[PDB]
Amino acid sequence: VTAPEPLSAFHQVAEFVSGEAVLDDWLKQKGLKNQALGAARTFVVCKKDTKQVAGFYSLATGSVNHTEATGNLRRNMPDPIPVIILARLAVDLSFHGKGLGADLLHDAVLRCYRVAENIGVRAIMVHALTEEAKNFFIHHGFKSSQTQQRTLFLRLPQ
Amino acid sequence: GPGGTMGRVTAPEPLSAFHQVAEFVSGEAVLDDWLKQKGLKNQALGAARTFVVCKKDTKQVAGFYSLATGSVNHTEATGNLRRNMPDPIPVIILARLAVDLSFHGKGLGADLLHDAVLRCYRVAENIGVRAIMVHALTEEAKNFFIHHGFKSSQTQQRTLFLRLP
Ligand SMILES: CC(=O)SCCNC(=O)CCNC(=O)[C@H](O)C(C)(C)COP(=O)(O)OP(=O)(O)OC[C@H]1O[C@@H](n2cnc3c(N)ncnc32)[C@H](O)[C@@H]1OP(=O)(O)O
Ligand SMILES: CC(=O)SCCNC(=O)CCNC(=O)[C@H](O)C(C)(C)COP(=O)(O)OP(=O)(O)OC[C@H]1O[C@@H](n2cnc3c(N)ncnc32)[C@H](O)[C@@H]1OP(=O)(O)O
Numbered sequence A: 001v002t003a004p005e006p007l008s009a010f011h012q013v014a015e016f017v018s019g020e021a022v023l024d025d026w027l028k029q030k031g032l033k034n035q036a037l038g039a040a041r042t043f044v045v046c047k048k049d050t051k052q053v054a055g056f057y058s059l060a061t062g063s064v065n066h067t068e069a070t071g072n073l074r075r076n077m078p079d080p081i082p083v084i085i086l087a088r089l090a091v092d093l094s095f096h097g098k099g100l101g102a103d104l105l106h107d108a109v110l111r112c113y114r115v116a117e118n119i120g121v122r123a124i125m126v127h128a129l130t131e132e133a134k135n136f137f138i139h140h141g142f143k144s145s146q147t148q149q150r151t152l153f154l155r156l157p158q
Numbered sequence B: 001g002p003g004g005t006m007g008r009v010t011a012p013e014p015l016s017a018f019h020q021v022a023e024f025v026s027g028e029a030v031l032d033d034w035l036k037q038k039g040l041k042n043q044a045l046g047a048a049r050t051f052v053v054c055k056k057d058t059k060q061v062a063g064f065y066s067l068a069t070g071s072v073n074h075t076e077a078t079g080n081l082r083r084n085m086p087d088p089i090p091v092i093i094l095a096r097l098a099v100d101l102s103f104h105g106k107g108l109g110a111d112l113l114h115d116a117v118l119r120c121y122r123v124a125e126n127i128g129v130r131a132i133m134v135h136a137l138t139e140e141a142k143n144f145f146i147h148h149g150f151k152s153s154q155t156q157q158r159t160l161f162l163r164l165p
Helices: A021-029 A031-037 A100-115 A131-139 B029-037 B039-045 B108-123 B139-147
Strands: A041-046 A053-064 A081-091 A123-127 A151-155 B049-054 B061-072 B089-099 B131-135 B159-163
Touching: A021 A031, A021 A081, A031 A041, A031 A053, A041 A100, A053 A100, A053 B089, A081 A100, A081 B061, A100 A123, A131 A151, B029 B039, B029 B089, B039 B049, B039 B061, B049 B108, B061 B108, B089 B108, B108 B131, B139 B159
Parallel strands: A053 B061, A081 A123, B089 B131
Antiparallel strands: A041 A053, A053 A081, A123 A151, B049 B061, B061 B089, B131 B159
16 A cells, blocks of 8 residues: 555545445545545545555544543643544455554554644544444553543553 | 833744743733643643743743644534534644733734744644634733634633634
């Protein structure tokens, strides 16, 4: 695949299938529209020598109240806690099991660290859609909320 | 205007341990004390990023502002801010803004706000952001933001927004 780049009208998305239709349909129907609105910024990777999207993720600003956080995350912090929402992350079924999911997450993390140089950010927050998704994030260092087991956080040490 | 001094200040730069803040006074003690007690600590925690301007040829702070990520529910927004948007709406919070009493009335409050706005537009290239949000501490502060293009929430006059796209 190609290096991560911003979603554009040059990207072919209509055939993308990840196994989660809510994510597939968001990419195809709302991805580019929501970029113009300031609702989310989407980054894609493409099959080599094509503009066919092989995987993507989306980032938006956000916050979390102390009750949905963890004991360590809320320590000595204001309420609510400033976060970046990793709103969506998916790889096409044809590319599963090749480390592209991990690679996309790593790119997202680095981009959040860069954003955090100019704006206050405590953590990356994700809402896991399934138990399998939650376990993927746990494997990569995310920690669950105490009240919602599918809300997870990755503290950005600074 | 001339304000209280005709000395200059430096360009905005990140708060650091090299900055003197202990003598800063803005007319609002809550802001003065946040800067002195929490400014640098909160930077390391990821609670807020603070940018300062200093008296020329010193490291003495003459003004500052602070930025953090945040969001707002549709009920607390405006119709134009929320139309076709997810709920809640992604924003950047202008958490703190203050100038030392000695430099009031010189356009430094406007200059700091302008630098804050440009910094938000740069951030927005990498992350979804709909608007800058501010909670005005006083009536005087609210009117200052209105003069520079911010719009009040319909329910709360002291919560104001500046749309970016
Ligand atoms: C993002 C949200 O908002 S929540 C929804 C999450 N997204 C989805 O569920 C959409 C459908 N699923 C997918 O798109 C993919 O399965 C992804 C993106 C979750 C993972 O990508 P994949 O290609 O399957 O995994 P990839 O090959 O990158 O695996 C990377 C590492 O994670 C591990 N891993 C992958 N899936 C899981 C899992 N469910 N549980 C634990 N570990 C996992 C792999 O074993 C590998 O580990 P290693 O480096 O120690 O060998
Ligand atoms: C950010 C928050 O969360 S709210 C808290 C805001 N901060 C504070 O209250 C701390 C105490 N006050 C201050 O530090 C300062 O008064 C500031 C930073 C708010 C403003 O800075 P000042 O030095 O007073 O104003 P500055 O000289 O930059 O004024 C710039 C312009 O705005 C105008 N202006 C200033 N105050 C007001 C006001 N209250 N109402 C309308 N217009 C105003 C000025 O006349 C000038 O207009 P122009 O550019 O058309 O000539």
